[PDB]
Amino acid sequence: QEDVLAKELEDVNKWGLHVFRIAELSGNRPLTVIMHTIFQERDLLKTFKIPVDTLITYLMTLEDHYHADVAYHNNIHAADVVQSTHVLLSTPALEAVFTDLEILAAIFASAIHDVDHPGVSNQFLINTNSELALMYNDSSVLENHHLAVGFKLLQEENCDIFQNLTKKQRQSLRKMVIDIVLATDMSKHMNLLADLKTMVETKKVTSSGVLLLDNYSDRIQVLQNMVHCADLSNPTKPLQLYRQWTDRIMEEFFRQGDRERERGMEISPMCDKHNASVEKSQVGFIDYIVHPLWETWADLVHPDAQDILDTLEDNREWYQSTIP
Amino acid sequence: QEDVLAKELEDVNKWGLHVFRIAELSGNRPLTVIMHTIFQERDLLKTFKIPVDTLITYLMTLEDHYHADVAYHNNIHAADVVQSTHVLLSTPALEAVFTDLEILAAIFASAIHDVDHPGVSNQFLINTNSELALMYNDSSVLENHHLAVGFKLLQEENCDIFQNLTKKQRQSLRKMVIDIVLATDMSKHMNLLADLKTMVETKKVTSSGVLLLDNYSDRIQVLQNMVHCADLSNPTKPLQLYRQWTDRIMEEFFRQGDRERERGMEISPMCDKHNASVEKSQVGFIDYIVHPLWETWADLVHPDAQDILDTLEDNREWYQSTIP
Ligand SMILES: CCOc1cc([C@H]2Oc3c(OCC)cc(CCCO)cc3[C@@H]2CO)ccc1OC
Ligand SMILES: CCOc1cc([C@H]2Oc3c(OCC)cc(CCCO)cc3[C@@H]2CO)ccc1OC
Ligand SMILES: [Mg+2]
Ligand SMILES: [Mg+2]
Ligand SMILES: [Zn+2]
Ligand SMILES: [Zn+2]
């Protein structure tokens, strides 16, 4: 069944990859096989002299540190965000906007961006006086931990995929990866969208309409918003995929709300399985978060995010129709 | 000896307290005895229902987690910053401005602000790929660690000095303490000073003559700069104290530079004992960092800090006079 696995992976460059099928066919190794394929498609293994066995050893270790008993924030989500970022990096409006190291940073960041996620929110970890919130002083608690684990795993035997990067390349990549993953904290969404909007208004492009980003500050802001868009890309995918992602996030939400109920705390929004409307929540999610973000992105890359935006608007219409 | 210690602690409200003598007379417990004295002087045990045995147990545990084998960033420095903050809080321009909870936060933040300091800089920890820098993603590495340790120690046996605060009080105190200690990161000094200058330029004074601070942002900004001033107060102290602080920081700098040299790293500024001018470095420190800060603070509380600024200026003249 490697030939159908191979056949599914030939669409690695397409929005709507069959990531769940790939997860099943690969023996629950979608992060490993999708990351491997993307590194080959972009020729990053010999651009950065990465030994293929070191790539696989690290990826398997990284994938192992995603929890198999969390419904959403697991290795399938990691693989999906990697692949969505990979596609957004190939947006024609961004042709060669980013160096090979900036490409490598966005892809690596996507792969590690949720590693060792416990399936509960930053606010839960804060309000419960968790060890993670104590270590990180209530500030981007999960995202700081995802980075620390992602980088620490490079120190395991035969796991340093960056061993042949120069010392300046490693320092630059580390900084970019940190900046990107910290930006995936949902509490920073509005600041990040405000900066994406400012870049839209002050946007400068060539005659073909390709974006011109001269400052590193602007380029990292685009990469931050890019991985944020990929993190929030479920409602923009084909509906058969999107509905599975909704099932999984609601499982996590409800199991957290149970804990907020058993411990006796205030139940987080959308986490009370006894007073939840899954469909109304998705429509509001799209209306207030996902669509404002993806329509600003589509403008920055105008008109290249039309097919993705079209799917999102189709899916919003469908979810609304499921509300009597 | 306890007789003499008690007499010296009568100076706790004065700039220029004999803090090294108190460290000796107290059996190397300056942080414990000065904190206890200040808490009694401000009636904080009664106000917050702190059991005296719990306070002493926490303070001795906190003091233990300062490194007795670092020349500068030890329990004497912590005691000095605590006492300096205590004097700055009593300045006439701030009378009745801060609540008891804000006072408690500022003093507690001062006490924990360098706990478990290893005697090397954030940049050294980043450049040597330390476990601390890996934990904290190269971002305010030491200061995040000082906070995590200072809070973690409250959980040890009979150490929760905040056990009788309301949950809302504990939540507010925790956020203020985090905001204050993170502002002691020297990489934030220029932005902190820029905002303090903006506040002085726009400052408002009540009919009572005290500073008007009517929002969290302005209130925490003043406490942040207060503790940062106390942290950078050595050159404003009587010369016999200042020179001891200079001897101690230069020992730490030179030891860090010896480690950098042996590792083949670029030696940090002022850390090369074969190429250092102690006196020129102090004059530059005053001219570019300490006097800009203290002159702005003195403007905020005018004329309360005039004697402190006069001492700083005299000490700058003294060090300058040793150069030719
Ligand atoms: C209806 C929302 O559906 C989704 C939400 C998300 C993420 O977005 C939020 C979020 O956004 C709030 C503005 C808030 C919390 C906190 C826990 C609940 O209070 C958690 C998350 C998720 C983190 O990855 C992903 C997919 C979703 O659907 C497929
Ligand atoms: C001549 C400087 O004297 C002093 C400096 C300081 C602190 O201020 C800096 C700092 O600020 C810029 C100078 C930079 C580094 C990094 C290591 C050296 O590159 C370290 C420190 C110290 C941390 O507590 C305290 C007292 C001092 O004298 C009594
Ligand atoms: Mg995340
Ligand atoms: Mg410090
Ligand atoms: Zn995610
Ligand atoms: Zn300090």
One DSSP character per residue, B205-219 reads B-TTSSBP--SHHHH
Q: What is the largest CA-CA distance in chain B?
A: 61
A317 CB contacts (<8 Å, ≥6 apart)? Answer: none
Q: Which two tokens stand for residue B171?
A: 């939540």
Instruction: Say yes or no for a CB contact (<8 Å) between B138 and A182.
Output: no
Instruction: Say yes or no for a CB contact (<8 Å) between A148 and B138.
Output: no
Cross-strand pairs, B205? B211
Cα(B272)–Cα(B256) distance, integer angstroms: 9
At position B42, the amino acid (one-letter code) is R
- B254 labeled binding residue: no
Interruption sites in chain B after residues (C→N beyond 2.5 Å): none
Cα of A191 vs its chain's centroid, Å: 18
Residue that has been written with the tokens 């795993």 in this structure: A153
- A234 labeled binding residue: yes
Instruction: Say yes or no for a CB contact (<8 Å) between B138 and A175.
Output: yes
Residue that has been written with the tokens 């010392």 in this structure: A167
Provide the number of structural domains found in chain A.
1
Cα–Cα distances (Å) from A55 to A33, A37, A45, A152, A241, in that order, read 11, 11, 8, 15, 28
DSSP string covering B38-89: HHHHTTHHHHTT--HHHHHHHHHHHHHTS-TTSSSSSHHHHHHHHHHHHHHH
A228 CB contacts (<8 Å, ≥6 apart)? Answer: A183, A184, A189, A192, A293
Cis peptide before B303 (omega within 30 of 0): yes
Cα(B183)–Cα(B296) distance, integer angstroms: 17
Cross-strand pairs, A205? A211
CA distance A289 to chain B (A): 27
**A211 torsion bin: left (phi>0), alpha (psi -120 to 50), beta (else):** beta
B143 CB contacts (<8 Å, ≥6 apart)? Answer: B113, B181, B182, B184, B185
Cα(B324)–Cα(B320) distance, integer angstroms: 8
Write out residues with Cβ below 6 Å of ligand 1. A 121, 186, 234, 245-246, 249, 253, 268-271, 281-282, 285, 289
DSSP string covering B258-311: HHHHHTTPPPPTT--TTS--HHHHHHHHIIIIIHHHHHHHHHHTTTTTHHHHHH
Q: Which two tokens stand for residue A206?
A: 């060539």
* Among candidates A137, A148, A178 on the partner chain, residue whose Cβ is nearest the Cβ of B148: A137
B167 CB contacts (<8 Å, ≥6 apart)? Answer: none
3-state secondary structure chain A: CHHHHHHHHCCCCCCCCCHHHHHHHCCCCHHHHHHHHHHHHCCHHHHCCCCHHHHHHHHHHHHHCCCCCCCCCCHHHHHHHHHHHHHHHCCHHHCCCCCHHHHHHHHHHHHHCCCCCCCCCHHHHHHCCCHHHHHHCCCCHHHHHHHHHHHHHHHCCCCCCCCCCCHHHHHHHHHHHHHHHHCCCHHHHHHHHHHHHHHHHCCCECCCCCECCCCHHHHHHHHHHHHHHHHCCHHHCCHHHHHHHHHHHHHHHHHHHHHHHHCCCCCCCCCCCCCCCHHHHHHHHHHHHHHHHHHHHHHHCCCCCHHHHHHHHHHHHHHHHCCC
Resolution of the determined structure in angstroms stands at: 1.5
Please indicate if any CB of chain A lies within 8 Å of the CB of B98: no
Cα(B281)–Cα(B323) distance, integer angstroms: 11
Q: List the determination method.
A: X-ray
Range of the domain at A40: 2-324
Task: List CB contacts (< 8 A) between B175 and chain A.
Answer: 138
Residue A73 bears catalytic tag: yes
CA distance B273 to chain A (A): 27
Q: Within 10 Å of residue A28's Cβ, how many Cβ atoms?
A: 15
Cα(A278)–Cα(A86) distance, integer angstroms: 30
3-state secondary structure A259-309: HHHHCCCCCCCCCCCCCCCHHHHHHHHHHHHHHHHHHHHHHHCCCCCHHHH
Does the C-beta of B319 come closer than 6 Å to ligand 2? Answer: no
Q: Which two tokens stand for residue A223?
A: 């990469």
Cα–Cα distances (Å) from B118 to B69, B183, B215, B288, in that order, read 9, 19, 36, 26
Q: Which site among A123, A126, A136, A137 would you substitute to test the B interface, given the most B Cβ atoms closer than 10 Å to its Cβ?
A: A137
* Among candidates A134, A147, A174 on the partner chain, residue whose Cβ is nearest the Cβ of B151: A134
Q: How far is the CA of B232 from the centre of ligand 2 (A)?
A: 9
At position B205, the amino acid (one-letter code) is V
* Among candidates A137, A151, A178 on the partner chain, residue whose Cβ is nearest the Cβ of B178: A137
Cα(B21)–Cα(B139) distance, integer angstroms: 36
Chain A residues 108-137 with a CB less than 8 Å from chain B: 134-137
CA dihedral B190, A178, B268, B70 (to 10 degrees): 90
Q: How many CA atoms lie within 13 A of A27 on its CB side?
A: 5
Question: Which CATH number belongs to the domain containing residue B103 in this structure?
Answer: 1.10.1300.10
From the list A73, A117, A146, A291, the catalytic residue is A73
**B279 with B285: CB under 8 angstroms?**
no
Cα–Cα distances (Å) from A42 to A13, A45, A48, A57, A88, in that order, read 11, 8, 11, 20, 13
Cα–Cα distances (Å) from B288 to A140, B150, B284, B318, in that order, read 33, 31, 6, 17
Please indicate if any CB of chain A lies within 8 Å of the CB of B147: yes
Cross-strand pairs, A211? A205
Cα–Cα distances (Å) from A162 to A75, A154, A166, B54, B136, in that order, read 22, 8, 9, 49, 20
Secondary structure of residue B240 in the 3-state scheme: helix
Quick one: DSSP state of residue B36?
Answer: H
Measured at the alpha carbon of residue A246, what is the angle toward residues A240 and A252, in degrees to the nearest 5? 145
B240 CB contacts (<8 Å, ≥6 apart)? Answer: none
Phi, psi for residue B109 in degrees, rounded to 5:
-55, -45
